[PDB]
Structure 1
Amino acid sequence: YQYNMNFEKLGKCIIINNKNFDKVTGMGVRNGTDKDAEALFKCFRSLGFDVIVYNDCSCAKMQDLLKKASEEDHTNAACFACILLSHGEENVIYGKDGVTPIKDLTAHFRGDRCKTLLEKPKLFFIQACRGTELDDGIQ
């Protein structure tokens, strides 16, 4: 009933910290995101992850880095974790460059495309907007 955690390492944790955007995207600076990235790396380091922080990545940079991470050998890792910090809209996340679909970023880790994470939890934490609606709340 529990994922087997008896592996040499807990696993890799990739953090993508997108703060600054090309003006053509219409997106502004994401003040506060360095605070997120700092609290995340300390927190995930303390859990046991091998944590890497990337900053202001283009769309192709985000895709390639995740593609390459999926091609590493995770045989001796219990799991994988990725945290995205950026602008976004429904199903989509911004690079500094424009938008790329969240499905395409995560698909690199499908069972058939990353056999050494097979039967292992693949975690994605996403800080981004998913549209323009506001929640006014109640009570």
Structure 2
Amino acid sequence: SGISLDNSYKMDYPEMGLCIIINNKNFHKSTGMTSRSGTDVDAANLRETFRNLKYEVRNKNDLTREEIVELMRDVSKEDHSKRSSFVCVLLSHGEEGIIFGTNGPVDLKKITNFFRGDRCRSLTGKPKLFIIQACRGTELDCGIETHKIPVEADFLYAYSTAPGYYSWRNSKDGSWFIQSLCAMLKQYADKLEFMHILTRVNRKVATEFESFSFDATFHAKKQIPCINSMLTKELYFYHL
């Protein structure tokens, strides 16, 4: 044959993979967590956006911390042999390292570990994407006017906000991070490598949103998402 190169993840398996969207809007009264108004906008837009990329989307809504873990354990035991990648979107409350089911928290690690290269063989060496719209702490950004591969390899964490910070959601328009994520896939999935799309998403969230509140503490705050890439090749949502 000719000279070959292997800098990109193989994305021409018969199927792109599963997109799991976990949309948690209403929380058990006993936890003291408010309903996450507007997250249905986020859920519908993701579904539509990942449909266009040819992912097999499964929306789940108002899952308990047990149903979250069981869903993920079940999904990690399916046979992904014919699938190119795996995407999982978590829409919910949280703290650093943690996402809330409707009745209490789940550590992100417990979820992701299900897909470690050694625990989910049919996904070994395929890109596993985790998109997290949740709080990562309580800080507010005031802005300024202008043994062959690691088990942990091949993950990409697309964080809505920086470590330790609040994540912003609009009750009519959806969450800043997700509006921008879907817009930028619409417009750039057939042109840009994923890392360059997230960078666009970063710039949009950072440049075009400023919170508005009657409460001095919460008014005029900003957000910058966090890309955590343990990927080992470049990731394009198209193939040749």
Q: TM-score range by the shorter chain?
A: over 0.9
> Hey, what's the Cα distance between the residues in 1 that align with 2:32 and 2:93?
11
Amino acid at match of 1:94: F
For residue 24 of structure 1, give the secondary structure of its aligned residue in structure 2.
helix
> Hey, what's the Cα distance between the residues in 2 that align with 1:135 and 1:112?
39
| CA drift at 1:25 | 1.2
> Hey, what's the Cα distance between the residues in 2 that align with 1:46 and 1:40?
10
Instruction: Look up the match of 1:118.
Output: 124
Tell me the percent identity.
52
Aligned counterpart in structure 2 of residue 78 of structure 1, from 84, 102, 107: 84
Q: Deviations over 1:79-112 (max 9, x none)?
A: 0000000000111110001011011111100001
> Hey, what's the Cα distance between the residues in 1 that align with 2:95 and 2:13?
37
> Hey, what's the Cα distance between the residues in 1 that align with 2:31 and 2:88?
24
Q: Which runs of 5+ in 1 are unaligned?
A: none
Instruction: Look up the match of 2:58.
Output: 52
Amino acid at match of 2:68: M
1:11 paired with 2:17, answer yes
Amino acid at match of 1:34: D
| CA drift at 1:6 | 1.9
Amino acid at match of 2:51: R
Instruction: Look up the match of 1:100.
Output: 106
- Return the index of the structure with the highest Cα Rg: 2
1:64 paired with 2:70, answer yes
| CA drift at 1:124 | 0.3
Number of residue pairs aligned between Structure 1 and Structure 2: 139
Q: Deviations over 1:16-74 (max 9, x none)?
A: 00000012211100000000000000000110100000000000100010110000000
User: What's the TM-score, normalizing by structure 2?
Assistant: 0.57
For residue 49 of structure 2, give the secondary structure of its aligned residue in structure 1.
helix
User: What's the TM-score, normalizing by structure 1?
Assistant: 0.99
> Hey, what's the Cα distance between the residues in 1 that align with 2:96 and 2:32?
16
> Hey, what's the Cα distance between the residues in 2 that align with 1:123 and 1:133?
26
Instruction: Look up the match of 1:40.
Output: 46
Amino acid at match of 1:115: R
> Hey, what's the Cα distance between the residues in 2 that align with 1:5 and 1:34?
29
Amino acid at match of 1:73: D
Q: Which runs of 5+ in 2 are unaligned?
A: 1-6, 146-240
